[PDB]
Amino acid sequence: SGFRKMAFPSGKVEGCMVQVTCGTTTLNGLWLDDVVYCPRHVICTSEDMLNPNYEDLLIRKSNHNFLVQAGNVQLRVIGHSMQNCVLKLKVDTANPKTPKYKFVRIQPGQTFSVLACYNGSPSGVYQCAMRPNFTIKGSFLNGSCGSVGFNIDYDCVSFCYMHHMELPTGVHAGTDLEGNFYGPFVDRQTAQAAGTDTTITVNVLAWLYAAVINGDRWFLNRFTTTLNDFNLVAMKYNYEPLTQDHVDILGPLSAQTGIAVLDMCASLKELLQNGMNGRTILGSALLEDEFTPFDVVRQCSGVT
Amino acid sequence: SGFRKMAFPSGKVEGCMVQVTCGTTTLNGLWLDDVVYCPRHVICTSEDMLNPNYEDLLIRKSNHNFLVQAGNVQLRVIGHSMQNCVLKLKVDTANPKTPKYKFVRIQPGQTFSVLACYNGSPSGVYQCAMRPNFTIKGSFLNGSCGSVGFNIDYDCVSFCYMHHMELPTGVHAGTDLEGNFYGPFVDRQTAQAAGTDTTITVNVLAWLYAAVINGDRWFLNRFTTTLNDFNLVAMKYNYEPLTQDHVDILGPLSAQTGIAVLDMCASLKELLQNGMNGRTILGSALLEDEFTPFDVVRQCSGVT
Ligand SMILES: Cc1ccncc1NC(=O)[C@H]1CCC12CCC2
Numbered sequence: 001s002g003f004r005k006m007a008f009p010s011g012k013v014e015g016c017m018v019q020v021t022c023g024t025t026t027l028n029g030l031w032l033d034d035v036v037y038c039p040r041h042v043i044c045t046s047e048d049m050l051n052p053n054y055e056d057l058l059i060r061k062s063n064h065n066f067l068v069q070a071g072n073v074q075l076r077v078i079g080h081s082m083q084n085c086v087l088k089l090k091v092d093t094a095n096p097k098t099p100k101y102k103f104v105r106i107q108p109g110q111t112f113s114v115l116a117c118y119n120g121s122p123s124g125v126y127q128c129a130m131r132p133n134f135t136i137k138g139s140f141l142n143g144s145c146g147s148v149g150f151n152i153d154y155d156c157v158s159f160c161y162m163h164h165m166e167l168p169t170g171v172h173a174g175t176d177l178e179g180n181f182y183g184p185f186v187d188r189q190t191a192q193a194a195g196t197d198t199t200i201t202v203n204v205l206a207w208l209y210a211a212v213i214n215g216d217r218w219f220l221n222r223f224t225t226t227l228n229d230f231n232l233v234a235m236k237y238n239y240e241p242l243t244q245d246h247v248d249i250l251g252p253l254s255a256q257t258g259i260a261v262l263d264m265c266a267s268l269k270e271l272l273q274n275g276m277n278g279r280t281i282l283g284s285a286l287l288e289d290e291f292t293p294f295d296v297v298r299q300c301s302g303v304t
Numbered sequence: 305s306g307f308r309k310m311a312f313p314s315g316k317v318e319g320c321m322v323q324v325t326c327g328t329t330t331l332n333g334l335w336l337d338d339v340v341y342c343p344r345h346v347i348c349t350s351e352d353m354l355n356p357n358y359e360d361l362l363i364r365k366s367n368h369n370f371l372v373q374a375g376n377v378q379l380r381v382i383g384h385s386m387q388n389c390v391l392k393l394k395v396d397t398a399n400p401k402t403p404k405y406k407f408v409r410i411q412p413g414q415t416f417s418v419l420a421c422y423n424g425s426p427s428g429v430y431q432c433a434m435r436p437n438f439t440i441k442g443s444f445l446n447g448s449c450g451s452v453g454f455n456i457d458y459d460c461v462s463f464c465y466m467h468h469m470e471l472p473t474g475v476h477a478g479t480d481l482e483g484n485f486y487g488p489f490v491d492r493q494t495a496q497a498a499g500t501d502t503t504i505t506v507n508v509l510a511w512l513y514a515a516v517i518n519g520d521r522w523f524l525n526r527f528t529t530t531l532n533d534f535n536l537v538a539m540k541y542n543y544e545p546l547t548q549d550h551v552d553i554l555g556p557l558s559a560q561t562g563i564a565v566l567d568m569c570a571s572l573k574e575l576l577q578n579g580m581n582g583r584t585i586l587g588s589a590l591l592e593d594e595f596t597p598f599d600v601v602r603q604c605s606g607v608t
């Protein structure tokens with residue numbers, strides 16, 4: 001028993017982290033097979049970042065200008081290309097520690113682990129969610145760009161995120177591993193609005209199921225609701241509208257606990273309308289939305 | 305910016321996790337050099353665990369009864385010994401992935417990362433604190449015994465905890481790597497009381513300093529206090545009495561922010577006496593005590 005914000009074991013990703021230097025800028029690279037992936041802003045000086053012309057800036061760089069260092073040893077760059085907002089540096093050596101991997105574009109509301117890195121070195125790992133507004137509330141300082149987000153299915157690492165930017169509001173923005181930004185963001189030092197974020201309803205309900213499984217049951221009530229009634233309340237409290245697809249994914253948790261999904265929504269409704277009244281659920285005094293139904297089933301069953 | 309409950313990169317520890325089977329019981333082992341460390345209750349059947357005589361139970365076991373499997377390959381056991389509550393199995397092969405390591409006994413209030421494992425395989429990593437009552441609020445299911453807690457100083461892994469038991473109250477108990485239990489617990493299926501726990505005051509103050517650094521400043525007030533006045537409030541709210549040693553460790557955070565430690569205590573005092581009034585600090589609606597002053601300085605500076 002017990003329920004923690006658990007990250008995936010970061011070992012397979014640690015073996016891929018490299019340092020990439022271009023001119024005076026240093027950031028993190030992801031070495032998979034004979035390719036190093038990093039944010040294209042590695043080629044910019046702080047002055048360039050105001051309104052960078054990436055095609056022009058890259059034209060002044062050669063393979064020899066990209067210094068790639070894996071731990072202590074140097075990698076030889078034999079090719080460079082820009083794909084959207086990432087640079088792909090072809091190296092002459094395939095990474096011996098390349099795990100089985102996939103590049104996937106996650107949906108908003110999905111979760112992943114971030115291995116925060118500086119100068120090619122990992123400092124820590126944490127589990128976070130991709131916000132409905134495509135930002136992530138991470139922990140990133142100057143030098144963390146190129147750090148990646150991932151999920152792990154047995155031996156396969158699905159890379160889903162690469163860190164690029166910190167918005168003026170302190171929230172984080174980045175791309176998938178093909179250099180496509182999540183959200184409307186651009187890799188430019190300009191004010192950029194993150195749209196209205198919402199709470200991930202299905203994840204809060206999944207976390208309420210994890211609480212029941214672990215013993216926190218005080219929020220369970222004698223009430224039920226409908227998808228229409230619940231969604232009226234969800235809209236009032238800036239929660240994502242719950243759909244039958246969300247109810248279907250909650251199926252296994254509903255089956256294990258014997259608590260119908262609409263009954264759990266009625267508990268969530270009363271918590272949204274009344275608050276916690278000074279109590280906690282799984283050691284939290286607010287409604288947690290960073291555990292998907294899949295994360296809860298995994299942690300509650302022991303999937304390794 | 306941003307502040308997360310960050311765990312250490314678990315790579316060096318993943319390479320040490322093995323599976324240990326004895327009879328019908330399987331749990332996790334820690335392979336360092338030519339020795340495998342695991343909880344001694346691996347030699348017990350569920351019936352034995354009511355009142356086990358470990359010396360007698362171990363006497364019926366030989367090196368060949370301890371099946372140690374590292375991922376897929378089998379390790380040959382050439383020796384076995386009981387040290388307090390752990391078994392030390394001498395194997396004929398030194399682990400090639402043995403990192404630089406130390407065995408340390410942490411103090412209550414200190415934090416560490418846990419690499420949760422099942423059948424020798426890692427499922428996740430999370431950061432937690434050793435409670436003042438020597439329990440940990442972990443996430444552990446049947447099969448997680450032998451999972452370890454650690455800290456990392458550059459390339460050295462300091463092992464501080466091995467999971468052994470889940471108390472009837474759902475909280476966790478375990479030993480240092482010499483088999484010495486933290487707290488009054490015994491590896492026996494008997495009711496055992498975890499003493500009155502308290503909130504780790506210095507860590508809450510460290511977390512208040514991390515909030516100021518990241519922008520959450522609403523809790524800062526025009527007041528100050530004394531160690532005596534603050535400690536009267538701390539006792540009323542079941543907080544650890546703050547000492548000059550705690551104030552001295554908060555020194556670097558006090559210097560960086562320009563907020564005197566006793567001024568931060570006055571903010572904590574008003575939060576303890578008034579609550580949060582529906583607001584949050586670093587995304588939390590309660591006072592977080594699982595970040596030490598060292599954890600905050602590290603995350604806020606980028607120590608890798
Ligand atoms: C200082 C910092 C901290 C964390 N993450 C990111 C940053 N900074 C940035 O995002 C800057 C570096 C060039 C940039 C990309 C858009 C403009």
Ligand SMILES: Cc1ccncc1NC(=O)[C@H]1CCC12CCC2
Binds near residue numbers: 345447448449471491
């Ligand atoms: C079921 C479980 C889950 C998590 N952690 C631990 C356990 N269980 C135990 O602690 C049992 C197994 C033998 C034991 C040690 C004292 C009696």
